[PDB]
RNA sequence: UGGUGGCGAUAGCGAAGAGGUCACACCCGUUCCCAUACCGAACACGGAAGUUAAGCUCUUCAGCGCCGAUGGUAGUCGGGGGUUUCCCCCUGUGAGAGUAGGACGCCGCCAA
RNA sequence: CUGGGGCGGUCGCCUCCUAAAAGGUAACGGAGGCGCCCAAAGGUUCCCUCAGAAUGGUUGGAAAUCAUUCGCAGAGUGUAAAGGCACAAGGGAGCUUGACUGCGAGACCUACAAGUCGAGCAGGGACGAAAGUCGGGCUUAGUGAUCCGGUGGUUCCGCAUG
RNA sequence: GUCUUGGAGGUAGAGCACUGAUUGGACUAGGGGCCCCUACCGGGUUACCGAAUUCAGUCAAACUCCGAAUGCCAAUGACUU
């Protein structure tokens, strides 16, 4: 009877009001987080091209944790994907907050990217 | 009650502004902080 | 003859403040020149156009001026360079 | 957890066997209860809205929220602000001690209590319940205020139709007027 | 005798009547009607001069329809005063009549009653007319 | 199959089935990090018992909303005529509604 | 000013219509308003979405509040019309004072006087993790030359020199 | 200037997508009538008005979901001036 908003449903109404603030690229592709219930991802995307430049996720058979879906050991992907684009060298990227709060352990993904090098 | 009163400096004693404020709604000696060019920084500016 | 009956109650008018397309579709346009005066956002800005305090449209980096459409009935000013 | 262990052991499969659903989790429950004062001091001239705080926190220790008037009224008092009545929209496990204080404890402290509200459902599943007395709830002190108010308590179900919800509440065991 | 209840404005432009009407060039509710032939303003009193002088001749008759309705205030400055100085007093009401618009509809009536009950209202209306009946396709 | 994009509701409302190991989900708890004008509904956190029910995907429908003509007309530039509150031709444009019809999506990138 | 003048009424500013699909475009033509208000009704971070309707309830009433669906907007958007706005410029929190000094490439408008928009630079900030935004209120009204005196500051002049 | 092409703007027309105004029919929340009773709860009669809602159908300078004809702003290809 009580109709609820899904945590994916209204989240992309909070995500697009970040998408009206940033340009995707500027030799600096945008970088979003996807916080599911089980395991949490990271892609490096840029408008105009829509090219996912380099990516990985917590779902990765290489470099498992193996606690898999908990605190900042699951932000090794925040450490990995910044090290993954480090061989592309690109860049001091733009960071999407998705539709989540930049709070930790969503912040801790992008925390792991900065001492992995990338300036944001 | 709306009266336009300058907001003078405290580092140098220098008026430098005009602000709109209300005699009833803001009865205190009101204070903001702004930029005095003769003091070159952020500066305590009370009403005068 | 005549009786003196008035009056009209409605004589007043504002100063006519101007709007409309100040440039065309295909103009070279210097930096910071006003493309299109608006009361509100009757047309939105796109590439290399800002928005004024009067919500006006003015081009930052020079080049051509294209009036476009969002979809379905909503226009969009973008500036493309040479 | 005495009501909470009641339906988590028997009641939810009892409706499944009464009439079917797929997915045994598809069963209506207790969702949320919104207690109300609605008072507004009658009419703002007490001035103690906040008298309704002390009267309400001992139904359950949930901190309440005074409901602010979202409209200006031409026939009474007042324009917006100056809130009208308190509210606890309680949930969870404190939910399942509020109702154990209702059925076998405080609902017989309604004086002429036999059974009630044949038609007070909202048509599609909510259960409304007006309350006219306040010696009812147990941790209310008779040494205290001795002033008379009224209440609503709005029990919310999960079922699409109150068909399924009314038969749920009878498996809960709610005394209705028959 | 009809008037609009509460109009958005009390003094209005006079318009320019030309061409065929936007719609209602075809009697469709009842059986027989009059279709006008010229462009004119028809005042309030003339539809009052119609709904009376048809029910003279329609002693036991059907319902009389009127598809016209007045909404335009024809406007007079008070007489024997100079030009200008404000737009005048709203003198009453006046309807919009393009040519070609079927004015009335009359039902429950045969041919021969409708050729005189509808004729005599056309002597009161200031426009040359023609009788118009229905048609199926359809 | 999921995630992110780009394209005008031809992308949508609505009706109906089907899917869940993996993924997205609900779900479970609140000691933590952090939230409620109060409250683990939400927001945050860590976990895996239960689930296709809802979300979401696919599939059928054209009830609605949408797209959308051709022809023909209203209107009209430009001449020319009149019985001149208006009307008539000629040349060229051509609506709006309706309608024949389309459509309840394509095109990517990454990840399994 | 004027459909001779007088009496009446108006003199300036913002919005609409008349305005003829750029933009202006008149009359004693048709409507409203404006000589303010907000220390936050400003800036920013981050949330959320209306009005009305039905269904049932506490004194509860045609309506204050409270719950479930409807509800693309019929709500609000300080004040009044036009445009615009839900990804919000609409509501709610927190931190605040950018309601900023020196500017300003360039444009708009136009007799001039005026008026308007500004990308970008430096000085220092505010909010924000950053990205970044910020030179007042969604826009358009709410204001008036010069002369004359007063107040604060002046590594300016000073009537032979100080 | 003339042809091609790109546009901005909501007019004339139209139509009702809203702001209004409106014809007629179904639908009838409410009301009145008339009685019963109301000492009170209430009920029945309507060829009595009637809000919504709905089937059609009219009309707007301060109504537009739609939108012409020209007209203005320019481009780059010319062909004259």
From Swiss-Prot, chain B:
GO terms for molecular function: structural constituent of ribosome. Belongs to the bacterial ribosomal protein bL33 family. InterPro entries: Ribosomal_bL33, Ribosomal_bL33_CS, Ribosomal_bL33_sf, Ribosomal_zn-bd. Residues 20-48 are annotated as: Disordered. The gene is rpmGA. This is Large ribosomal subunit protein bL33A. Keywords: Ribonucleoprotein, Ribosomal protein. One of its GO terms (cellular component) is ribosome. Residues 25-48 have a biased composition (Basic and acidic residues). PROSITE patterns: RIBOSOMAL_L33. GO terms for biological process: translation. Part of the 50S ribosomal subunit. Interacts with VmlR. It holds the Pfam family Ribosomal_L33.
Curated annotation (Swiss-Prot), chain C:
Keywords: Ribonucleoprotein, Ribosomal protein. One of its GO terms (molecular function) is structural constituent of ribosome. One of its GO terms (cellular component) is cytosolic large ribosomal subunit. Gene3D superfamilies: 2.40.50.100. Disruption phenotype: No effect on sporulation at 37 degrees Celsius, however sporulation decreases at 47 degrees Celsius. The N-terminus is cleaved by ribosomal processing cysteine protease Prp. One of its GO terms (biological process) is translation. Belongs to the bacterial ribosomal protein bL27 family. Part of the 50S ribosomal subunit. Plays a role in sporulation at high temperatures. This is Large ribosomal subunit protein bL27. It comes from Bacillus subtilis (strain 168).
Swiss-Prot record, chain D:
GO terms for molecular function: RNA binding; rRNA binding; structural constituent of ribosome; tRNA binding. It comes from Bacillus subtilis (strain 168). Keywords: Ribonucleoprotein, Ribosomal protein, RNA-binding, rRNA-binding, tRNA-binding. InterPro entries: Ribosomal_uL5, Ribosomal_uL5_bac-type, Ribosomal_uL5_C, Ribosomal_uL5_CS, Ribosomal_uL5_dom_sf, Ribosomal_uL5_N. GO terms for biological process: translation. Pfam families: Ribosomal_L5, Ribosomal_L5_C. It comes from the Bacteria. GO terms for cellular component: cytosolic large ribosomal subunit. Part of the 50S ribosomal subunit. Part of the 5S rRNA/L5/L18/L25 subcomplex. Contacts the 5S rRNA and the P site tRNA. Forms a bridge to the 30S subunit in the 70S ribosome. Interacts with VmlR. In stalled ribosomes contacts MutS2. This is one of the proteins that bind and probably mediate the attachment of the 5S RNA into the large ribosomal subunit, where it forms part of the central protuberance. In the 70S ribosome it contacts protein S13 of the 30S subunit (bridge B1b), connecting the 2 subunits; this bridge is implicated in subunit movement. Contacts the P site tRNA; the 5S rRNA and some of its associated proteins might help stabilize positioning of ribosome-bound tRNAs. HAMAP family: Ribosomal_uL5_B. Belongs to the universal ribosomal protein uL5 family. This is Large ribosomal subunit protein uL5. The keyword Ribonucleoprotein applies.
Curated annotation (Swiss-Prot), chain E:
Keywords: Ribonucleoprotein, Ribosomal protein, RNA-binding, rRNA-binding, tRNA-binding. Coiled coil: none annotated. GO terms for cellular component: cytosolic large ribosomal subunit. Pfam families: Ribosomal_L16. PROSITE patterns: RIBOSOMAL_L16_1, RIBOSOMAL_L16_2. Gene3D superfamilies: Ribosomal protein L10e/L16 (3.90.1170.10). GO terms for biological process: translation. The keyword Ribosomal protein applies. It comes from the Bacteria. One of its GO terms (molecular function) is tRNA binding. Binds 23S rRNA and is also seen to make contacts with the A and possibly P site tRNAs. NCBIfam families: rplP_bact (TIGR01164). PANTHER family: 50S/60S RIBOSOMAL PROTEIN L16, LARGE RIBOSOMAL SUBUNIT PROTEIN UL16M. Part of the 50S ribosomal subunit. Belongs to the universal ribosomal protein uL16 family. This is Large ribosomal subunit protein uL16. It comes from Bacillus subtilis (strain 168). The lineage of its organism: Bacteria, Bacillati, Bacillota, Bacilli, Bacillales.
